Design a protein around this ligand. Structure first.
Ligand code: CYC
Ligand code: CYC
Ligand code: CYC
Ligand code: CYC
Ligand code: CYC
Ligand code: CYC
Ligand code: CYC
Lengths: 194, 53, 22, 160, 161, 48, 160, 161, 160, 161, 160, 161
């Protein structure tokens, strides 16, 4: 054995990043310094970085105070955070609706779009109702309530079973913000039939 | 065998007189939902993680 | 894109070449 | 198809097809000799079914063939009858597949969005299918008319 | 996905035609073999744990892929190995009931060669665990049923190579 | 070969409608007739 | 490890390690010379721990080496003891790593799915790790035997 | 990510080896220098904001990059500049504690040279600001600790060029 | 066979086969495609049925393979499994013959005299046919396991 | 490329088989219809230029495709379009002699649907010019030969759509 | 094939097959029934041709089966005759293909580079094909023995 | 491509520096092992036909791939396969003399995985014919020389997987 043989066998498998992952959530009787670490962690999931460099300072200030008082849950703080002027300016204006779908599932579901029936379902919502009806269909879905509930913050969610979703979800989360302007899942190559 | 299965799926169509939301994107129709779209295609493909987490 | 936007063409700065006498 | 609609339900729960589901597929494929005969009685009575069903539609809906109506003129009434043949052809697809899958995937998904773009009253298209259903169900026996009567009833409820 | 019935209806539908005598003869080709498929599909559903247990013993159990440094080394790799073999066996039974390999293209083979190259899973060792599973299944279902089930084991192996 | 005979430059012997070579004397293939125009001068590129 | 596990918790929160977390890392590096000594004691007594602990298992579970048992014969009993050498190697990793993550990630996740597919009784693989625990705890002092007894006890509870 | 300990357990695990004398030497090297790293990790964590204020003043604050039309012109462009230096200093401290540069390839350098080319960020100016941050830190923490931190600054600079 | 058993009864009385006897012979030949299918499955699952039926036997009768047992040793255990393969082969001859005649004329007449003269416990051979019966009935359908169980049951009764 | 004979030798060679009764049936099918194919191949080769002249007159000489602004407007675009019908008729005759459509995938359809999309050539119009060339040929050569040539016209049309 | 070689020669020149080339293809399809009969005679005498041909080869070249020879032993002599069965299969392909293309593309290109790597004498593989030629030419008439003698003679010259 | 001497000169040249004491110590690391490489390089050049003849016998000689239907079946495919093994063995000897794996990236691994996927050559069976060739070569050159030669057999296998 040598450095080339050993280096090749240590990297096989899915990733150690799946095992080295932290999940934020609210248990009973949190302080105000603990609510503030959960809120800042939710801003790194929905915006992919912390808001100090791309906000003026007063856009989501009332959502923060309303959460630290325990008045809204983590599910309401995330719906109210994704349908704000900060998200609209960051992940809806510069991109088409086909790329807004792949980013919405990435931030609020932790996975790429499943199949074509899902791409054509969200595309019809973004055509008729707009962005805020899009966020409500993600946070109010049954998939969201099962994996995140009302007390957890979404995470990267390494998937297995839908037979395109592992390599697609890895291309979304392994690219950095504004790395390029490519659409990962523009659509699925048409299978014969209807 | 399919009789009771058909009489129920037929009642779902009639009683599903839901309202409308959004802007019409097909003439006067074309609201938030597409007509008669099979819901089992969107919700029948599920995201699963072996060793759930 | 926006108001204050970067482009290689309107960049007369010596930032892509480290001529440090300017 | 009924085989396709059973595979997607089992794939949803990530399991093999249940014995009750394999029992349907056996009882369905064994009846294929009679489904192929019901679809042939309608395939050779296309002109009587469309010419008679469309003839009744213009007595119950005289406004689509009046001035300003959608099917006004000889070329728009011919396009009217073209659509009644599109939907009869799909009914024979559903009789042979044992399910409404071929109808809903061809001509039921987004059907209201289509006619709203053309100006066509959806209540007048469902009226022409209801009049074709009596002509079609009158060519068939007691329980063959009950199988054919369903695909006409699912198309009506989906078209409203 | 389309099965053998929808594949015949879709061929007439793209011409605007009713089902003619040739398409009706293809429909009879499926209705005849339909009771042979529900018999084979019910015997694989009951002997699924046995087929996968035998395909692993014959293929990849005492080699260096199960030893320290192999893909299947850790107990998490072993349980992922024999779970993939349970995906191929369940989806190859869907394709045999339907009589069409179209479900294997959207729900099995889509992005599957990019998945294994990302992780480092040996493709040649996977094809022989699928080929050994085809050999164990032909013994259980018969010779005429095993000719159909083996038709969709080779579709997975040919699109996976 | 049709342009050549359409402009009256020359006659190119070809095939029948089923693939057999044309011929004026059935011994050899592609034999063509002659006389009074093959020896007339000043009409080399006539009709052009 | 203590170091890796603390850095992933501080990178998930996007800050530096606190002075209270930097002390748990200093308390762990000071015990490294002692941890390295205990692991070289188990590494030079490999055969004695696997052979003796194996002979002890066959007295406690004599049915696994009986006719019809899983580990029956020369070749299946050598594979039996091959597995006990895997778990003793992992225990020396966990001692030097300071935690049970090397043992969990290798040979404790999906361990019931592997043995249930090979036909081996999971209940007998836990009694064989219990028997290597006492053979190993007899080579160490009273303070080190409680040190390494932790890692042998975590493997058992995960294997039940 | 793997530290100096996990890096040695993983390399011996893919070979099937118990920890020999050569693996015990690499483990002793980390345990000896381990007290030196927890001392520098607490000194960099307390002077994090003022280390980058002084490192920018030595490299980029008195060039003309902030001149109108540069990369760092607007306030958004300037605030994103110093947020990266916050990244590099904080991830070089995770690498100095772990004793392994493995976390920089996973969570820093993945697709970063393509991200700067898409945005237009000068790569050589970032390396020059990192080389100043390397010198400001090597005087705060000393020569031994400063020579270890400078080992992971050069790793970010080599993977960025 | 059944044609043999019917000709013998007509030959014995010096008469032609009755119409009821010809009806049974007709019913028997129409089953040949089903009998040939079950027999070919048991023929293709030899090693699975014999290895599993044998390993299940050594868990209920551990003494026949222990020191002092009849099937003690590598060569004597291969003959133990050689005999289970003889009785599976005869079961396939009884399935296709539609009768227990081939099993009786081969390996059931004088079987107690043979196995006692070899030193082999007859009850241990009947226990291996009952274990080898369950592995066969688990690879077959619910209706196919009813026919194959008729021949495994008759052999066990005759072996007692 | 492989013809009907080479196609049977190649399929038996990858299995290690001598030519059995089922391979001898496919070889007899070609040897019987072989005299019918050398007759149509000589009648199509002699009427090649006038078959395309009549097939264009029946499909797209009297549409508005030649109107200014569409494809086949200029002389270069009109001459390049009859050169393709000149291609399809000559390669469908290589496929009718060989009894195998293998030469059409290799030397005709390879990257052709992408070439028409890059240039802008209407693909549905090319299919109806080919369907007219099928009607003109099926009357010249007869019903049996015309039904074989129409088998390889549909192959070019299916691989083009 | 004769049909393939003509089409690639006409495609290289962008033309149709000439009436002289279409006659050589018609002369080849009329001999198809005769070619199918000759190759079907060699296919039902494979054992006699390969066993006798190789058995007769060991008389000519007794050093290949001697101690130290390449084809020494049960396994190396069965592999010896395995190669002769390969080249007889190819000869039946060339008879039905009408030419030596199938024999050249399989087992004649780089054949001296392969046997020189395995250690087999190429001079002995040619004497074994010469011995199958006479065993095969004895089963055929005088007109067919010169037909198949062509394909056996081309394999030899390529193997020298 | 660059050898171990150019790799040290190119590292100093990129900084505009003369060869310092650390780069001079890397130069001495190569000059010491230089006579051990010319001995191993001369013994592989003479036993090249023997090494390849043994890697084939131990790996892929009596398996399903030398049989009808597998790659390496025909004699043209057998001679092409043992010629590839002679390419890997000659280029792995260039990389051992140079002490750098850079020549294996431009002249061996460039486009090599796209070449085998085009033809259908099994990659996993190739890696084990290269791994068997590493085992035969370590017996001929020794243990310390076989540690260097095996360093460039694993570079080819890791970039080929
Ligand atoms: C805001 C910019 C934007 C656009 C334009 C967009 C388009 C878009 N068009 C789509 C489909 C489609 N688009 C068409 C369109 C056409 N068919 C024809 O023959 C025509 C000539 C044509 C009219 C232009 C059809 C038929 C489909 C459905 C394909 C299918 O169901 O397989 C789909 C897949 C989802 C769906 O089927 O609803 C998307 C995402 N997305 C975007 O974000
Ligand atoms: C239904 C179609 C479909 C398939 C097949 C599929 C496979 C699939 N296999 C995976 C992993 C894997 N697959 C294997 C498989 C193997 N290792 C071997 O040595 C064998 C040769 C081979 C199996 C025969 C291994 C070792 C992993 C990595 C698991 C881990 O590292 O935790 C993963 C990553 C998630 C995980 O399992 O941890 C997916 C998504 N996904 C799909 O949607
Ligand atoms: C590092 C984590 C790890 C473990 C633990 C592991 C186990 C493992 N145990 C195996 C077999 C086996 N394991 C046993 C073990 C036992 N039989 C008994 O009766 C006892 C109760 C028990 C041991 C105490 C036997 C008998 C086999 C062979 C199974 C057979 O072929 O019949 C095999 C298949 C053959 C092989 O060894 O390659 C694996 C992969 N692999 C791993 O990567
Ligand atoms: C933890 C690892 C990591 C890194 C390193 C990282 C870099 C990174 N730098 C960015 C932008 C940026 N980076 C700079 C940087 C610079 N301008 C200059 O003049 C200097 C030479 C240079 C800094 C020294 C600027 C100006 C932008 C903003 C570009 C824009 O707004 O157009 C962005 C765009 C999105 C965002 O800021 O949230 C990312 C993702 N992200 C990461 O996750
Ligand atoms: C801008 C360059 C350009 C040219 C020149 C051009 C020519 C052109 N000439 C055509 C037909 C034709 N051209 C003629 C011409 C003639 N008949 C005679 O006897 C005379 C010798 C000759 C007069 C010059 C005739 C009769 C047709 C119709 C042929 C038919 O329909 O069969 C056609 C087919 C139908 C049409 O679109 O008109 C084209 C495309 N197209 C172009 O884009
Ligand atoms: C042997 C297999 C084979 C095919 C099929 C083939 C097609 C082919 N068609 C071409 C152009 C063309 N093809 C057309 C065809 C048409 N315009 C219409 O309106 C009709 C719908 C259609 C005639 C049916 C036109 C107009 C061009 C010229 C494009 C241009 O000049 O911009 C070109 C560009 C080459 C050149 O101009 O030198 C190629 C390569 N090449 C091949 O090697
Ligand atoms: C169809 C074209 C074709 C041929 C011919 C072919 C030959 C071939 N001959 C082989 C071996 C062999 N071939 C022979 C043959 C001979 N020994 C003698 O003394 C005789 C002179 C001679 C036969 C007349 C022997 C002895 C071996 C095994 C050598 C060994 O393992 O020592 C092998 C390696 C093992 C195997 O059979 O898989 C191949 C691939 N492969 C092909 O694809």
């Amino acid at each position: 054995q040598n450095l080339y043989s050993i280096k090749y066998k240590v990297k096989q498998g899915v990733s150690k990043l799946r095992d080295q992952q932290k999940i934020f959530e609210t248990k009973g009787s949190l302080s105000k310094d603990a609510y503030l670490s959960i809120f800042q962690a939710a801003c790194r999931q929905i915006f992919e970085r912390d808001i100090s460099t791309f906000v003026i300072g007063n856009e989501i200030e009332n959502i923060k105070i309303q959460f630290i008082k325990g008045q809204i849950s983590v599910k309401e703080m995330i719906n109210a955070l994704g349908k704000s002027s900060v998200y609209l300016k960051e992940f809806y204006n510069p991109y088409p609706n086909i790329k807004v779908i792949e980013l919405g599932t990435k931030h609020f579901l932790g996975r790429a779009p499943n199949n074509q029936a899902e791409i054509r379902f969200y595309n019809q919502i973004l055509a008729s109702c707009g962005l805020q009806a899009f966020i409500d269909m993600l946070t109010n879905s049954q998939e969201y309530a099962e994996i995140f509930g009302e007390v957890r913050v979404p995470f990267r969610r390494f998937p297995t079973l839908p037979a395109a979703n592992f390599p697609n979800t890895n291309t979304l989360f392994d690219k950095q913000t504004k790395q390029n302007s490519v659409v990962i899942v523009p659509s699925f190559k048409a299978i014969t039939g209807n | 065998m399919v009789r009771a299965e058909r009489k129920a799926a037929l009642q779902a169509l009639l009683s599903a007189s839901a309202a409308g939301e959004g802007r019409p994107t097909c003439g006067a129709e074309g609201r938030k939902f597409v007509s008669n779209a099979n819901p089992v295609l969107v919700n029948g493909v599920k995201c699963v993680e072996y060793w759930r987490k | 894109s926006g108001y204050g936007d970067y482009s290689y063409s309107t960049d007369r700065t010596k930032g892509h070449v480290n001529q440090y006498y300017v | 198809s009924i085989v396709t609609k059973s595979i997607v339900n089992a794939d949803a729960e990530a399991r093999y097809l249940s014995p009750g589901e394999l029992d349907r597929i056996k009882s369905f494929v064994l009846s294929g000799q009679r489904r192929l005969r019901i679809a042939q009685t309608l395939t050779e009575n296309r002109e009587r079914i469309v010419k008679q069903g469309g003839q009744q539609l213009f007595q119950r809906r005289p406004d689509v063939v009046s001035p300003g109506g959608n099917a006004y003129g000889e070329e728009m009434t011919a396009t009217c009858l073209r659509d009644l043949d599109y939907y009869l052809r799909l009914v024979t697809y559903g009789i042979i597949a044992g399910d409404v899958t071929p109808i809903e995937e061809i001509g039921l998904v987004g059907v209201k969005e289509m006619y709203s773009a053309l100006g066509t009253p959806i209540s007048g298209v469902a009226e022409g299918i209801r009049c074709m259903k009596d002509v079609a169900c009158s060519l068939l026996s007691g329980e063959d008319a009950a199988e054919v009567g369903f695909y006409f009833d699912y198309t009506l409820a989906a078209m409203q | 996905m389309q099965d053998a019935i929808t594949s015949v209806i879709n061929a007439a539908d793209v011409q605007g035609k009713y089902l003619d005598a040739n398409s009706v003869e293809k429909l009879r080709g499926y209705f005849q073999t339909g009771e042979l498929r529900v018999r084979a599909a019910a015997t694989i559903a009951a002997n699924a744990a046995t087929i996968i247990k035998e395909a692993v013993a014959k293929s990849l159990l005492y080699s260096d892929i199960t030893r320290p440094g192999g893909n299947m080394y850790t107990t998490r790799r072993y349980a992922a190995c024999i779970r993939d073999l349970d995906y191929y066996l369940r989806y190859a039974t869907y394709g045999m009931l339907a009589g069409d390999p179209s479900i294997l293209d959207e729900r099995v083979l889509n992005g599957l060669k990019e998945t294994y190259n990302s992780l480092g899973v040996p493709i040649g060792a996977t094809i022989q665990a699928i080929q050994a599973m085809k050999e164990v299944t032909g013994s259980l279902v018969g010779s005429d049923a095993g000719k159909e089930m083996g038709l969709y084991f080779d579709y997975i192996c040919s699109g996976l190579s | 070969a049709n342009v050549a005979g359409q402009e009256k430059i020359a006659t190119i012997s070809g095939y029948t409608w089923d693939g057999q070579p044309q011929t004026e004397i059935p011994g050899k293939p592609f034999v063509k007739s002659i006389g009074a125009m093959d020896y007339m001068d000043g009409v080399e590129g006539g009709d052009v």
